[PDB]
């Protein structure tokens, strides 16, 4: 099957020089990459990443840094970045919050925590914009049933409260 | 598939850098997309619309909001802009119908509005370019029997009113 | 089906500016878009003009107009020029005879007027190239039974007088 | 089908804007086009020879006009030039041998007198360059037998002889 | 086949000019080539090899030293710097070790020598950053049962014991 | 078939203006054609050639002269030097291996010439670089048989008397 990379770097565009910003420009255009063509198999998203990043033979991936479009920008995140031991993750997620959402520090945090819940959620308290939405955002947490639950519904109830206060991705206000 | 987005691109142009300018840009450009490429699934309409953005800009969409091109053109209008945004509507509805005319204008806005026939009629019967248009506007538009039949029925009753008068497109003399 | 936009608009070229000069473009670049790719429906004849003139929405066709070449040049023209009364139709004939020859005045005449013989028939008269072309052609058009068979034959007739005096489209000689 | 316009127009160039110079134009690219795809029904000449001219030329061919690329260079000569390609042969063969040497006006010669060698042969006869050459090419053309295989081998033998001469194409001598 | 030579070379970029700098840069490119095209057959990575570097006759390569990608760097490293280029190999690991770090140097510098484990594993011991990552990198190598299994997990080993330290891919401290 | 002249002809580039020069050109870019397009038959060869160079001075091959890319690049240089081009054919392997080295300028050389393997090896044998690869040179090809095997085994036994004292391409020391 041939990649039709022509296409894919008219939407994609040229990445950014400073290669601590590939992990994250690569989540932004994740979905419009699987608009131009639809990655299905762990197999093309190597192949479809190796191709669009070129000559750098330092962040070139394999088949098992691919299953979701997330291994994948954690796999470059530890590659561009290094190894952090767990008292450095808080300062992790908040470099993330700042620049993007709540939102993006939520799935990469729990992607360098091993699905951590607990951890991750306890961090990111600290980081929401506002007193009014920290307390609401609990209360429609503790309605759920187990942590699991928890884990799936986080994303879903954090845009639900910001509808309500009318706030965009990155809790200013429209 | 694979969405030719090279040649797509070339016919539409640049999306603008302004995301409070995408929403019109995407009503303007549909029927050319629409033209090169055939759209019959939701599916489908999601994945031209998030790879014509390009990502960069940061608006994308899911299949339940692109059952249609007036339902996805509305929802990223709410997404930017606010929700109950009917004083800026105004304003957007404003500008066209100054530049390019009243039958432009309402199709539009139905689009943003997300296809509120009493809402962006009321907006339109303001710039209309007359006491008298207006009134035998209206007049027509009361023998339709709902209001679905009357927002299917309004550009051709507008442009029978027009043509009586001499006036073009613009709502200029002819004559 | 994909229309293949990026050839049909090499073998074509950039539409022009003014939006006036689109109708008549349009229709002597016909033949050229049905080399490149064989449009048989009014549905691909529609998607093919709607992405050619690109973003712009206001020239935007239906598969209603779009059911010959010709319906669909003398729709853009009335969006472009504005609907006129019955009385100027002889300033409007004149108008393209003198851009464009007779053969394009008749057709496009004959379908603004409902395809209206016996008017667009004695406008043109008037305008043909001398004494003897007039009486030449008339005399061809008058063996003929219906009336119907003297509007389906007026170009193949007009076509075989220029042949024999040798002009040109408009009526210039060819030397 | 969609035929090859990216390829055909790579090999071919851009048409001369001059319309007098387009039938002798089409005439010497007419193998080239053959070569990078193979022209077999003559509905299939018609699309190619009007996608290449190109709309803005305004000369457009019928598939009748198209049995043979013969019949397609005759049809535009008469309707850019206004006379018959016969009226004056010995001034359109002398005219390529200034510009583009005897080989190519033999091939495009007989083109226009639809295939008459007795007369073409006559007329290259006192345009060749040197009267050794003359006598040199006839001895060849008199060892083949029929004034067909002639007609087959004329080429072949031409550039023979300008090679033992050591002549280009043009005529001129290489050294 | 056809090849894709247009998208490849886009990818790839324009190949270096002093003919020394080949060998490594198509080390580094060689995941992208596999990437858009996937590359099977010694024979088709030949043709893919012989049109990038497009006119350079001296490093063309025949379907004998183009097994795998690798084979293939090595044969050109050969071609231009000698037969056991055992200071130069020296001087370019150096190199990539100072600029890019450790396990980039392993990579490029295990294609150049041929897979050659125990000589590129001797020049890096002595670029890595302490007396103690020496030591702790060659007890989990010397655990591995063979040389073949050690060449495999490598880079793995390396990492890991990076992480402890607290290091990163350049070899300076992140605490 | 189709011949697909637009993208043959972004691969090699375009043909030079002097109709001398593109004998050797059609030459060097051989290989890059048979990247793009699997050449196969006498047809199809000389349908590309013609395609290539379509417009200039009747420079146009037929199935007969084109069964191998050498029996095309000799006929081209024919038509455009002249019968027998013998001064001008000393030249051009004088001015290659000047620039380029030995082998390009003796395979670009029998292409030129028609696979005459005692004229290029006459005009080579005087640019050798030292005494010793010269002798060195001769005790393998006089260990040959025939001479079509002399002509044919000629680089292969060049590259080895390079490799042993460490000679590169141009004949200078590494």
New interface residues.
């Given amino acids: ?7 894919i ?5 040229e990445p950014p020089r400073n290669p601590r910003e590939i992990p994250i420009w690569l989540g ?11 990655v299905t198999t762990p197999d093309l998203r ?3 990443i ?2 669009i ?6 962040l ?1 991936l394999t088949p098992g840094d691919c299953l979701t479009w997330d291994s994948a920008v954690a796999t470059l995140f530890i ?7 767990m008292h450095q993750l808080g300062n992790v997620i908040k470099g993330i919050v700042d620049q993007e959402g709540v939102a993006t520090a939520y799935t990469l945090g729990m992607m360098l925590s091993g699905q951590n819940y607990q951890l991750v959620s306890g961090i990111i308290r600290g980081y929401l914009p506002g007193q009014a939405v920290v307390t609401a955002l609990q209360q429609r947490l503790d309605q759920e049933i187990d942590d699991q639950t928890r884990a799936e519904t986080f994303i879903q109830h954090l845009n639900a409260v910001y ?1 309500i206060l ?1 706030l965009n ?1 990155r809790g200013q206000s ?1």
């Fill in positions: 099957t041939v990649i039709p990379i022509q296409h770097r008219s939407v994609t565009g932004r255009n994740a979905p419009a990459i699987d608009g131009v063509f639809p190597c192949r479809i190796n191709a990043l070129g000559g750098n033979i330092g070139s590659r561009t970045h290094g190894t952090f031991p509808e009318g991705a429209i």
